[PDB]
Paper text:
Comparing the [name].4 Fab [name] complex structure with structural data of APO [name] (RMSD: 0.909Å) derived here at a resolution of 3.12Å, did not indicate major conformational change to the [name] core structure. Alignment of the models shows no major conformational changes on [name] upon [name].4 Fab binding. In comparison with the APO [name] structure, we observe stabilization of ID1 (N521 –K522) loops upon [name].4 Fab interaction.
Author numbering: 1 to 415, 496 to 541, 554 to 694, 699 to 714, 716 to 735, 749 to 1059, 1092 to 1990
């Protein structure tokens, strides 16, 4: 044993392992993890995520694969002249017989491997990976053999060839020789530069000895790369003996006889032998195997005798015809056999030179490694291990040699084809099943025959725990891809066939091979099926069933499907018998049915797997045998179950969930029976338990939370239900992701944003491909994206338990970790280790609704609100969300926020200033002020809308937190009272700071600062305090001057009303007396006989009035809105008159006279409006262009009198009161005559009291309550007018009992609304005219509006007459509208003109005011006719490529992207099925996204479908190009950083691309003025609206994704076209800047789009991190004390003020935004389409908390692709992992891990982290000084705004 050598077979693994001698191989192994492989489109992260999916995109695309030899395919085959010749030197026609041994490798097209920049191991191994992947694909996919036990040997041969190429030992080398010397020299020169990292001290550099170490170091990587493409049925290592072998060794892992693909270690140790000798197997073994196959396979028996009938052809005639007509002309083809059997023996005939050591006629290259065979094989003993004798397979072809004699006998005797198609419908659910399913195949060739119903025959001859364990490494388990994922059922591991190592052991009576024919094989399979049925009959009945068969039928179905998967080879689980039964099955199915395997290159069978799948699809006989086997039979309960087509993982999931549900029902029945209070769970709180019902709840909790042994039921393995469910969810989401990223599937209808696919393969209409990926793809688009939804769909109903606990919902609780093992000792590891929050679907520790019904007592009204989560909890210790800690004393009541611990440490403080706890109180209080103001504003408007639809949740979850927030405001004001009391010392010292300024004053500052921050771009712009005329609203919102901020909360809490109430209500009273109005003879009114302001009534036209805009001489400056023509022609009655200048007819009378005058005036004007709208003479009344007869409103009576009478009432009201802009007849005299002449001395008496003083402020406040006396008259008139025209049969009503609405207080807004409605109606009429003009002059001859060139197809009068009037109308209306929108926005603030107009009138939905009245000269140039330019300007919009006379500058353009916009929650979609309140925020980049080009085409293509798609595609491409160009212009030149700017710009462009894709697919979360109409019209176009909404969305998604456009350049989908357009825009920007094209954005493949909310969240996180870093660095550079003192330093205490103010102002709204984002995430994560709040799925989100998800995403460094966010030292301190290691004290490190200090996200927003705690005091005091100064400024500003009473 002392003569051990180093040959590395089985014993040199631990003794001879000298590879890892020094720390060099660890860095020598190649890890291709560098981002952006060249500029062709490679990426490191894609390769790291999966090594098996490497493509040619890692270098120049489409032009790399070995052996660039240009042999053209379809003219010749096997024609080469390369090697040598002697007589025909011109070429090499035929001088050597090259075998097809290596010529069949992936060696055909485009080995253009010459490019440079390959410098390191990352770039070095890329070509090796490409070669390995390509050779594996070529050797596996199209393999002419019958898929026998030779694919492993073929892959081994390919790997040996690759190893020889790398080592250079290969002898037959072609064009790769130039690289081989290049690798030996260039890659030597580029790898020897790092002399520090390598120990090449011996001369010279040890090139070979270092490259061999490099290859040994990366031995594994190339192994899994080359084996990536192989199928799981490889079954490597030829030794197939059952659980043993001729070379018995120790137990290491499950190498028997599989698990090499996932082994992560080399299985083939035969490559470590000296490779010089290793190369003999290439010559001999391949010929041996091929000849052994040739001699035996084509034996076609003697069935071609042509006895029954004469046959012209026999299929194979080898001896019957040819050898009878002649002797050997057709059979004597074996001549290559003294190199095989007559050319064989040129291998081992070198024994002539005996005893042969030193070779003198060879080369000297250190041949000591090959000197072994000098004596080892010639004249030495051959007594060694079994690797030479016994282990190799040398006699397996019926060998009967008698080379040895053994007289002793002490051993006992041993003891062309059809291919049908089917569309059987799977029903994997019990609900309505709104969709269907399908399958394929069926053979009708591989079967029994006929004459079914064969029965009888008999007498042919305890793992009961779920193996949820790692992969089968020793005896049992699952597959490597399925390890610890789903768990193996006991029935599945105890099924009969899985226990049989070979199929030939089916029958005990016969003990030899019996499967030689198809029927013979099927007979054994049927025997196995019958045995399984009998075994299940023995097992299940009759203990778990009450005489029925549902359990028995379920077990038979599951076992039937498991047999199907096992015989198909798609089994996901393994035992000791499996992987040998599979090998025997494959050997049988290769020996039998081998002829049908012909379709290797294109009915026949493509491969062996499809053949086996087809055989199994011939399953009715097997199912009938299984069914008849046990007791099911016939005449007791009588089709084929569809359970088998469902994937085995899903079947295992359903079985495990059914087991868990049965156990849960057993454990919850007692809980339901007992936990009732007296007879129901909710009743009496006292003695809720009858005696001790808590024991049942304790049992349930123990069952749920056990570790599999402390009370838990059968199932799992030492792990909780929660852990097992999490593993299941992870595996299921991985399957969903793989299906979505798959390329091949059947016919489906994609309708999800997170989907991409090019081709869908199927042969039948509306059929899925029946594969696992296709089945998961079909699972997608009907929901079912999560296990919760899938199980909710497939489960029966009440099997989950007596309590209805649907799997869709999620219930959260808190629990202690398993008590068997304590993490890192006990009593000091952490607090959360004992308390961890869990959130599964109804796996909670309580039976769903009995969270509070259990453990006695009933849920209080306070905690029911928390359960409903309608009003979330934010603060803890005395709050807007319940609970309080006190105490009523001096110090100190603080409103602590949830989840963050308040730190009262006063060590941060200094002397003579505020205390640390007071500063923390101030910060907490200002945050509380902001958040509570926001929440009151949000929740004050909801009211839940009733009815429809205690009285809802306004008694609970409302009117409770109102009182409790009143209490919280009282607490906060009491605490601030103590805070302000600190002026006993500092008030005189710092007069006048008040130490500090009072609470009401601070609230005033807070609201003013809130206004300034939004409307003046930051609080730092408070110097620009000129608010123009927005003060009135602002002083209304903030109170007149200071010392009234307390009143702000007083009002904001006293207005918590207007609902509940309710009460009953008081409705309904009666109308107001009295009708009368029968005196139609109202005399004549000199004012107006007819309001002919919109022309005259037919007959006769003319006299149209015009909108009196501002700057009119009669109204002075007129800063208000325009005067309506109806108001201009208003029927004043007998009050005002003309012909005498200003005449007041009613001058000496009282108001008693004018009620009759106003009454008959409104009567006549209303009766005219009833006639002014029947004839359509009013602009508001007239709709479309036919008139009011052909086109009429639906509401029973002409549209435009209810609004007209409302406007008349409003303008009469302001006529009495005094309008903002007096109209025409100087209304005021009425406003100073019955308090002067007709407003004169009424009702206040003229008798003065006191005297001159206190006499001029008691008279001017009376006329506000006298205006109500006219609405009754209006009601009487409007009811009376409709009731004379009884000529047609109808009653007098506008649209039924519907009355005119109220809220008639607003007047200028009413005028604006009237103007907007009239403008929209006129625009619709003009649009109809333009469409008519575009349809006319265009006939069947395809004429185009009579256009000639000219300068293209321009209009010259056909539709120009119709469109120029529209153009001038838009011009004048823009003139009127830019002067009204500004006034309305300044008056109301926060309400845009469009968001006011659109909802009040349906006709405004088609108008985008921003685009129509865009203020841009480029807009005027490119859109001469406004939004209808595309209809009129018919130039056939056409997106031009990057080159060949591009037209971008001459094309339509927009403005540059804004850089400092704020996140806004406006324009969020209003989801149907209300109370779906989204808390999301639109990114600035998305809300500034330019899509203005779409809108004209969107308007144009309303009619004329099948033409919209081309125009839409073109405009989308040009928009994407311009968007990429402007985003690059916004990002890249702002700092010329080569990497940061480029990567940030590319990430932003990818985000914009994904947002555009979501807009197209309809998954966008924003409905602004643009995208709302874009989505509406896209829905109208796609599907033509004749389908449903889901169908429309699916059509849109399919159109975006599939290859829809037919182009002459390959088959590029619309998504690819848009990405290419964005790339072209980036190229334009780069060329303009004269830079280099970015390394990223060169990717042709764009990844799967994450959900829009998640992308927005990641963008928000990245922006927040960058802004936080910038602002904190500014603060640390400025607010930190100077190095040369402060008083005498370079600072003036001003730049620190600026930095602190900027930081606080930026951080204040970010907390609210993050709170909203987290609130939405906590309700959206881990949800599918059917359960998420929105329709889109979120199954890819696997993270309990948003912070954890961000840590999983933001931990790394941004690269430009996929990774779009990063965090550096945010929050905590400038140090990342790692500082302290837990290994040195107690294993292991359990964080785990922090992954960047992003967990401080919640704490930093409360200004509580250490980084801000360093500068909190100075920032706070500076903020307070700023507060005082700006109150001074604002008060002075208001006093100056008073202005008027000073001088003239």
């Amino acid at each position: 044993m002392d003569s051990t050598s180093t040959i590395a077979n089985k014993i040199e693994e631990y003794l001879g392992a000298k590879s890892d001698d020094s720390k060099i191989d660890e860095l020598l192994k190649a890890d291709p993890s560098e981002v952006e492989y060249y500029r062709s489109g490679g990426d490191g992260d894609y390769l790291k995520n999966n090594i098996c999916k490497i493509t040619v995109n890692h270098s120049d695309s489409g032009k790399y694969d070995p052996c660039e030899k240009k042999l053209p395919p379809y003219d010749d085959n096997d024609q080469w002249k390369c090697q040598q010749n002697s007589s025909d030197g011109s070429g090499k026609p035929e001088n050597i017989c090259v075998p097809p041994r290596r010529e069949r490798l992936c060696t055909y097209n485009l080995e253009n491997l010459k490019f440079d920049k390959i410098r390191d191991n990352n770039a070095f191994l890329a070509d090796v990976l490409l070669t390995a992947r390509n050779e594996g694909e070529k050797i596996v996919q199209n393999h002419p053999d019958t898929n026998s036990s030779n694919v492993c040997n073929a892959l081994e041969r390919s790997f040996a060839d690759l190893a020889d190429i790398i080592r250079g030992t290969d002898q037959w080398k072609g064009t790769n020789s130039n690289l081989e010397k290049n690798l030996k020299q260039m890659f030597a020169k580029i790898r020897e530069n790092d002399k520090v990292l390598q120990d090449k001290y011996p001369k010279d550099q040890k090139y070979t000895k270092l490259r061999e170490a490099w290859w040994n170091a990366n031995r594994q990587k190339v192994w899994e790369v080359i084996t990536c493409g192989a199928r799981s049925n490889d079954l490597l290592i030829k030794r197939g003996w059952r659980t043993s072998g001729k070379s018995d060794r120790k137990k290491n892992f499950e190498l028997c006889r599989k698990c090499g693909h996932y082994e992560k270690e080399v299985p083939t140790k035969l490559d470590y032998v000296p490779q010089f000798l290793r190369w003999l197997t290439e010559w001999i073994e391949d010929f041996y195997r091929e000849k052994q196959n040739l001699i035996d396979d084509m034996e076609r028996h003697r069935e071609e005798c042509t006895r029954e009938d004469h046959k012209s052809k026999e299929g194979t005639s080898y001896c019957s015809t040819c050898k009878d007509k002649c002797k050997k002309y057709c059979e004597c083809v074996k001549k290559w056999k003294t190199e095989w059997e007559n050319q064989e023996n040129k291998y081992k005939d070198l024994y002539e030179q005996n005893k042969n050591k030193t070779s003198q006629k060879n080369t000297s290259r250190y041949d000591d490694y090959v000197k072994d065979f000098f004596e080892k094989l010639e004249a030495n003993y051959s007594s060694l291990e079994n690797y030479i004798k016994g282990d190799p397979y040398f006699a397996e072809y019926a060998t009967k040699l008698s080379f040895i004699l053994n007289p002793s006998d002490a051993n006992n005797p041993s003891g062309q084809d059809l291919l049908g198609i089917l569309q059987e419908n799977c029903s994997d659910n019990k609900r309505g099943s709104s969709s269907n399913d399908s399958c394929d195949n069926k053979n009708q060739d591989e079967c029994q025959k006929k004459l079914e119903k064969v029965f009888a025959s008999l007498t042919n001859g305890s793992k009961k725990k779920w193996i949820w364990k790692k992969s089968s490494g020793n005896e049992e388990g699952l597959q490597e891809e399925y390890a610890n994922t789903i768990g193996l059922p006991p029935r599945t591991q105890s099924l009969y066939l899985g226990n049989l190592p070979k199929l030939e052991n089916v029958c005990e009576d016969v003990k030899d091979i019996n499967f030689d024919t198809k029927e013979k094989f099927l007979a054994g399979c049927l025997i196995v099926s019958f045995h399984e049925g009998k075994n299940l009959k023995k097992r299940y009945p009759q203990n778990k069933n009450s005489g029925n068969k549902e359990n028995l039928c379920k077990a038979l179905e599951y076992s039937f499907a498991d047999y199907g998967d096992l015989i198909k080879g798609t089994s996901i689980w393994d035992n000791e018998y499996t992987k040998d039964l599979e090998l025997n099955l494959q050997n049988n199915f290769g020996k039998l049915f081998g002829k049908y395997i012909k379709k290797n290159n294109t009915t026949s069978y493509s491969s062996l797997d499809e053949l086996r799948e087809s055989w199994w699809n011939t399953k009715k006989y097997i199912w009938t045998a299984m069914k008849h086997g046990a007791e099911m039979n016939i005449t007791t309960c009588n089709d084929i179950p569809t359970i088998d087509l469902i994937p085995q993982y899903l079947r295992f999931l359903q079985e495990w969930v059914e087991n868990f549900c049965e156990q849960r029902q057993a454990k919850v029945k007692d809980v339901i029976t007992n936990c009732k209070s007296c007879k129901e769970s909710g009743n009496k709180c006292k003695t809720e338990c009858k005696t001790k019902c808590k024991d049942e709840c304790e049992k349930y909790k123990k069952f749920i939370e056990a570790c599999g042994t402390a009370g838990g039921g059968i199932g799992t393995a030492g792990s909780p239900w929660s852990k097992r469910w999490d593993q299941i969810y992870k595996r299921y989401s991985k399957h969903i992701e793989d299906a979505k990223r798959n390329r091949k599937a059947g016919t489906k209808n994609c309708g999800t944003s997170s989907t991409t696919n090019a081709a869908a393969s199927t042969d039948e209409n509306k059929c899925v491909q029946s594969d696992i990926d296709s089945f998961f793809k079909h699972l997608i688009d009907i929901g079912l994206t999560t296990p919760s939804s899938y199980l909710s769909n497939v489960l029966d109903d009440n099997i989950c338990g007596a309590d209805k606990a649907p799997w869709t919902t999620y219930t959260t609780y808190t629990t202690t970790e398993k008590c068997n093992k304590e993490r890192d000792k006990s009593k000091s590891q952490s607090s959360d280790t004992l308390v961890v929050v869990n959130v599964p679907s109804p796996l909670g520790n309580t039976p769903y609704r009995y969270k509070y019904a259990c453990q006695c007592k009933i849920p209080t009204n306070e905690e029911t609100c928390d359960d409903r989560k309608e009003y979330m909890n934010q603060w803890s210790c005395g709050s807007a969300r319940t609970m309080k800690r006190g105490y009523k004393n001096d110090n100190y009541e603080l409103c602590k926020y949830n989840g963050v611990d308040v730190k009262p440490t006063t060590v941060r403080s200094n002397s003579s200033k505020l205390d640390g706890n007071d500063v923390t109180f101030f910060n907490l209080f200002e945050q509380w002020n902001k958040e509570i103001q926001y929440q009151i504003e949000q929740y004050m408007t909801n009211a839940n809308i009733s009815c429809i639809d205690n009285c809802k949740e306004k008694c609970k979850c409302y009117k409770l937190w109102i009182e409790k927030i009143n209490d919280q405001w009282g607490k906060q004001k009491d605490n601030y009272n103590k805070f302000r009391s600190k002026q006993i010392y500092d008030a005189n010292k710092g007069s006048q700071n008040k130490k500090v300024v009072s609470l009401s004053n601070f609230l005033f500052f807070s609201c003013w600062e809130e206004y300034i921050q939004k409307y003046f771009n930051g609080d730092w712009s408070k110097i620009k305090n000129i608010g123009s005329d927005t003060f009135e609203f602002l002083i209304k919102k903030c109170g007149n001057n200071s010392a009234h901020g307390e009143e702000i909360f007083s009002e904001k809490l006293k207005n918590a009303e207007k609902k509940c109430k309710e009460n009953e209500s008081t409705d309904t009273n009666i109308n107001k007396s009295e009708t009368s109005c029968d005196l139609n003879a109202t005399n004549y009114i000199r004012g107006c006989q007819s309001k002919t302001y919109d022309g005259k009534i037919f007959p006769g036209k003319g006299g149209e009035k015009q909108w009196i805009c501002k700057d009119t001489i009669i109204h002075g400056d007129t800063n208000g809105a325009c005067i309506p023509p109806r108001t201009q022609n208003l029927c004043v009655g007998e009050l005002w008159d003309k012909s005498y200048g200003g005449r007041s007819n009613i001058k000496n009378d009282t108001k008693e006279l004018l009620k009759e005058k106003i009454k008959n005036a409104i009567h006549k004007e209303t009766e005219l409006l009833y006639e002014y709208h029947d004839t359509g003479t009013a602009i508001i009344s007239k709709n479309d262009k036919k008139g009011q007869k052909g086109k009429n409103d639906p509401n029973g009576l002409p549209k435009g009198f209810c609004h007209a009478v409302q406007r008349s009432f409003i303008d009469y009201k302001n006529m009495i009161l005094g309008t903002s802009v007096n109209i025409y007849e100087h209304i005021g005299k009425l406003q100073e005559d019955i308090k002067k002449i007709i407003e004169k001395g009424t009702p206040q008496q003229k008798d003065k009291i006191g005297g001159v003083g206190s006499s001029t402020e008691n008279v001017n406040a009376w006329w506000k309550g006298i205006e109500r006396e006219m609405w009754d008259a209006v009601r009487c008139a409007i009811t009376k007018i409709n009731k004379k025209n009884n000529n047609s049969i109808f009653n007098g009503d506008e649209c039924g009992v519907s009355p005119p609405t109220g809220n008639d207080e607003d007047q200028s807004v009413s005028w604006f609304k009237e103007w907007g409605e009239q403008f929209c109606i006129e625009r619709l009429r003009y649009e109809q005219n333009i469409r008519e003009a575009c349809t006319i002059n265009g006939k069947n001859e395809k004429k185009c509006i009579n256009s000639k060139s000219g300068q293209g197809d321009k209009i010259q009068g056909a539709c120009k007459r119709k469109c120029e009037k529209y153009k001038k109308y838009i011009s004048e209306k823009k003139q009127e509208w830019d002067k009204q929108k500004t006034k309305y926005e300044n008056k109301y603030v926060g309400k845009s003109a469009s968001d006011l107009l659109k909802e009040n009138y349906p006709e405004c939905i088609s108008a985008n005011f921003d685009f129509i009245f865009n203020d841009n000269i480029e807009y005027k140039t490119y859109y001469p006719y406004g939004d209808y330019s595309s209809i009129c300007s018919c130039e056939q919009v056409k997106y031009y490529k990057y080159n060949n006379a591009e037209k971008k500058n001459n094309k339509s353009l927009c403005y540059e992207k804004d850089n400092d916009m704020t996140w806004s929650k406006k324009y969020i979609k209003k989801l149907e099925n209300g109370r779906s309140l989204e808390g999301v925020y639109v990114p600035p980049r998305r809300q500034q996204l330019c899509l203005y080009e779409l809108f004209p085409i969107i308007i144009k293509n309303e009619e004329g479908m099948e033409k919209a798609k081309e125009e839409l595609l073109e405009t989308l491409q040009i928009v994407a190009e311009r968007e990429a160009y402007y985003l690059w212009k916004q990002y890249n030149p702002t700092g010329k950083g080569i990497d940061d700017a480029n990567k940030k710009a590319c990430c932003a462009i990818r985000g914009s691309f994904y947002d555009l894709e979501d807009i197209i697919k309809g998954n966008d979360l924003v409905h602004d003025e643009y995208t709302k109409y874009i989505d509406s019209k896209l829905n109208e176009i796609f599907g033509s609206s004749n389908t449903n909404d889901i169908d429309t969305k699916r059509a849109r998604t399919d159109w975006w994704e599939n290859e829809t456009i037919t182009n002459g350049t390959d088959r590029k989908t619309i998504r690819q076209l848009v990405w290419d357009a964005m790339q072209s825009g980036v190229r334009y920007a780069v060329e303009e800047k004269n830079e280099n094209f970015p390394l990223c954005m060169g990717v042709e493949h764009i990844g799967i789009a994450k959900p829009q909310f998640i992308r927005w969240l990641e963008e928000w996180t990245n922006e927040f991190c960058e802004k936080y870093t910038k602002y904190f660095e500014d603060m640390k550079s400025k607010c930190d004390p100077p190095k040369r003192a402060d008083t005498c330093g370079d600072n003036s205490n001003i730049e620190c003020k600026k930095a602190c103010a900027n930081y606080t102002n930026w951080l204040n709204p970010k907390r609210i935004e993050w709170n909203g984002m987290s609130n939405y995430y906590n309700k959206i994560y881990r949800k599918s389409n059917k359960e998420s709040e929105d329709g889109k799925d979120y199954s890819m989100i696997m993270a309990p908390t948003v912070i954890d998800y961000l840590n999983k995403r933001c931990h790394g460094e941004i690269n430009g692709n996929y990774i779009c966010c990063s965090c550096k030292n945010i929050g905590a301190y400038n140090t990342t992992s790692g500082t302290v290691n837990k290994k040195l004290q107690k294993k292991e490190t359990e964080c785990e891990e922090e992954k960047g200090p992003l967990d401080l996200m919640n704490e930093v927003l409360n200004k509580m982290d250490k980084k801000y705690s360093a500068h909190k005091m100075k920032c706070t005091e500076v903020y307070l000084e700023h507060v005082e100064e700006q109150l001074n400024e604002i008060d002075n500003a208001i006093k100056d705004y008073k202005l008027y009473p000073l001088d003239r």
